[PDB]
Amino acid sequence: KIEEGKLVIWINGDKGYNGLAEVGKKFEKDTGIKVTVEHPDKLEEKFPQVAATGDGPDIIFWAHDRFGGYAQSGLLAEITPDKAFQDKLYPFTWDAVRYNGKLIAYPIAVEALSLIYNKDLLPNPPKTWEEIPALDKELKAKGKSALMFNLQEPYFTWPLIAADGGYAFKYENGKYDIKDVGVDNAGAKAGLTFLVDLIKNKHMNADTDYSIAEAAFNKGETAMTINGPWAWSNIDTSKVNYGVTVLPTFKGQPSKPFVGVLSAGINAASPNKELAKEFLENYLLTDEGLEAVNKDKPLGAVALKSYEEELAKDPRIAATMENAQKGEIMPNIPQMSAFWYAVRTAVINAASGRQTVDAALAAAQTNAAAMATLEKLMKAFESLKSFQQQQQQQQQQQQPPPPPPPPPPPQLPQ
Amino acid sequence: KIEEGKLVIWINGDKGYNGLAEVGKKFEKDTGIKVTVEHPDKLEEKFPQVAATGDGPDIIFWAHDRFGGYAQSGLLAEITPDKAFQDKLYPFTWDAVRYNGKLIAYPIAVEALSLIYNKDLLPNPPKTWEEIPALDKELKAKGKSALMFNLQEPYFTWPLIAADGGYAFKYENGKYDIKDVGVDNAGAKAGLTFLVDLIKNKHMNADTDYSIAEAAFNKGETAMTINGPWAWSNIDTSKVNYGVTVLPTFKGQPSKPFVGVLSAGINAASPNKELAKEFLENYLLTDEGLEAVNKDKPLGAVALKSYEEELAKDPRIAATMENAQKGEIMPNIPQMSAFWYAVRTAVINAASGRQTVDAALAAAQTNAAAMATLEKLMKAFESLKSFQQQQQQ
């Protein structure tokens, strides 16, 4: 809970919690305040439960895109680092921890998709998407393919579609304009067109998923793939002489991958907000702190400028940061749920031929507002029923509103 | 019974309708136009039924908050008192009778919660909320409690919550901005926290409702309660030496109770709009008009400045007008229905520990703004339902 006089930290099991515990000991040595690090199962699901009743950890570690939902439910304390501390980190990461004007977390690490290439098949990676078709028929002559990446998930296909001017929601002040959606502009249109052309000219298969794209690259069957820092360990094992580099340009514009930021938030119910802020600002977000965490489990690229420059000596890490700098910070707003489902269908339908490019993307725009507001209404029936639970004396699994009558007037009058 | 050459007035049975008929005989004397006053059952429900077909009274009396829904359905005629008539009343009472720029009703009487205290247990009432925890323990030593009021309805708990900067919807031009909700700001957050602190520090019970809060004050078991002019008649009966005063301040700010304004609206279907406006401006909203109504039933505080000053000699009425002047005029808009159910759940959950202050209020701004889809959904279903039952049968 609160944990008055101490600090309890939740961080996912797959991270460097042992390294974080070691910063905890260093903090315990100069202050006498003991730090407890734990990694419960599905802590991103548990936090919304316990924090709503004033319990839980003092500080939570998760990808920034979950925090928008938390801050909306008032579960995170507004943080106030002064200007001096802010300049210690990359200015773009602060934009990943801002919910409606307010700063609600500290950025730790940075993730983004990169171009991963087989050095032995490709001496040098293309700087340009446009030259991939030419490159594929050069490698096909050797029974090899140029590129294979997951086409089923928008996360992977977005970098291209967004390249010439697409975007999820327009951001211009720490606040996302939810009626300015850019899935239906000329830039996005140009991007998805190129992608569909790649599939229909047989340079790519419409059924390529994560597993198939990973198996092909790790068996040296394909020259290139698009993936993030979590996929590297498997390529090390495959013994593929691989490189990680900046994504290819399209129509002269860099690709725009989604940027996910590991963030540290303070529970709005913690009485140890001061302790937590001193721990994060002066012990963890330091070269010595991140180093200790990194040693246990690599963070990839980090938000702190000083330690990032030390980690950039690895050209894989330097490439993940450079991609992220030219990429699009993933909106933390609830309307993103709609965007995922809409663009998923728009890409799958354009790819298979079921729909055209212009139609698939135009339908997504409508599906964005339609599915997005639906979530607001779904919360209304879910809050009206929830009020009834606490009034009388899984269970909420009800949800009626099934009256959508379609009036079809007979416009005959001849 | 469309009227035509006569005035038929509607007003609730609990009001000075016999005093109103006395002004209606006065009008009949200088005009030869007979005034009929009636008080049918659930008139506030019947009025929208009959007015939508072009029937019912020429003029209607009810709290200003119901008038928003009426004027939205276009059942009220616009009124035009000139600059001279408007300055006879308190400026703020005109803000209660404004529906999207247009004035639709004449303000009559003003209602707000006040601090009612036992003079025999409390010499001077506390000017400050912050000092009540200290006053309770001083009274717990004697087997008494400092304060007990209804914690179940947000009408009673709002004064405190809104004190430091909370508000329902932002008003700034005879028009409410329905996207500017103030249940989740630092003002509301500071207020509700204080209220919950009281409950967990056992200066208050989470299960205190209207009945329990009234019983306790009327048996002298508690030194203070918060209530309105309607409860006065029961405290007289209990023989408690009581006082009515301005509500305590919080963080230096005055408490902000909701303001209910009893108002007179003219039926849009009434052929007697001119007669009505003459009766209301020149006969009823005068010292003698309101007196006649008041002698039948007390209005409490009144909108007319002149007659308010004569009534102000009662310190109970004097405090009601002070509280109402520092309070918030209850929005007349349909989005208020959402506000009631959401803030009500928010306070209940915060008090019982089921949810924190920050969490209950942040999810209150969702429930209240998200119940607006009910407005469009339930109104669109229900709207189309009427046409279904007409086209299909």
Next chain:
Amino acid sequence: KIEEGKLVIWINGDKGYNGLAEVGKKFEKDTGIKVTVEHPDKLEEKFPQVAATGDGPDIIFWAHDRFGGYAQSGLLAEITPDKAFQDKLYPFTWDAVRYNGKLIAYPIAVEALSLIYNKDLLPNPPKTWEEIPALDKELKAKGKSALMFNLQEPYFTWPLIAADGGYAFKYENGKYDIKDVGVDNAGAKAGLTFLVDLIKNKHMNADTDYSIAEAAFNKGETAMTINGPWAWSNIDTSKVNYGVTVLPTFKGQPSKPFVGVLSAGINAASPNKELAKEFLENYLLTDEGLEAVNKDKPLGAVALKSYEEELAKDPRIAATMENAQKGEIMPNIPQMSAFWYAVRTAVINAASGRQTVDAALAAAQTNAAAMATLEKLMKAFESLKSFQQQQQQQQQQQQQQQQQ
């Protein structure tokens, strides 16, 4: 089919498609490119289905209001006629073919309601609505009625209602503000009030529909009726000595009838965008082009200034254009579905006495918006049912294609 190297044109079967095919042969003579005009059943429903999968015609002919939904679904190619070609047509017709700033089609013909009168019963038609009461009494003495028109649908009753300031959605920049509805203002209030007054003063029956209104005018029972260019051929057969003129003014303001504009849109999937724009701009939208189409089946008033002035020799056509120029261009946006349903009820309720004018209108202004927001949420539940269609199929293409 596909289209590559030719043109395929879709137009409704009640138009001059043979005359359109005749423009098609003239094009084929100078170019060699074959033009195939076809008129399939319910083509305005078939077009969204085939155009979404990249099929259908190169060019499509329909009333402009249907194109909003097409351009929203991205089924129409943005057209670019230069300032020189744009000035050959009436400026107001271009506004009927703008979807959110972009031009999506070519204007062909214009259609609006007009006052149609029996010159044997009425020598000179009234310029004023206000005088129809007095005129009725004068004709009632002879066992005739002054005016009889379809009161059931708003399309017909709108001209009056809108006359003094009523409007569907405010339009100011090729873009409709859907929060600015005008069915509740003083203008609309005044118009419907006048209509209600006519019905309760028994100058008009609340149950007059299209069929009753048409029969009455064509049996010489009523002196006047409002209607459009489509009802003319029935009046010719009735042997009624009739005229067609400008609609009566209310409170000194002209009646605002809804403007329907026949339009030519280019499929965004068509490989022959340059061919189609060459056909339309320089072969069809010319004196000789529309003339060939007109001779097969009349277009009524036309968007091209030059040929319109030759057609204006007919006073009927000259008046359809004059009514259209003072009227309101029908919004092409999806919120118009809700507009029709809300105003249809509002009028029927106010006329039957079931509701007052103030109530029935202020209900419509809230109802039309309430259905509009539902419309978006219905293309949602159904669009989530594309998962039912798809996610079931890609599971049966996976359980069935791996035949157990």
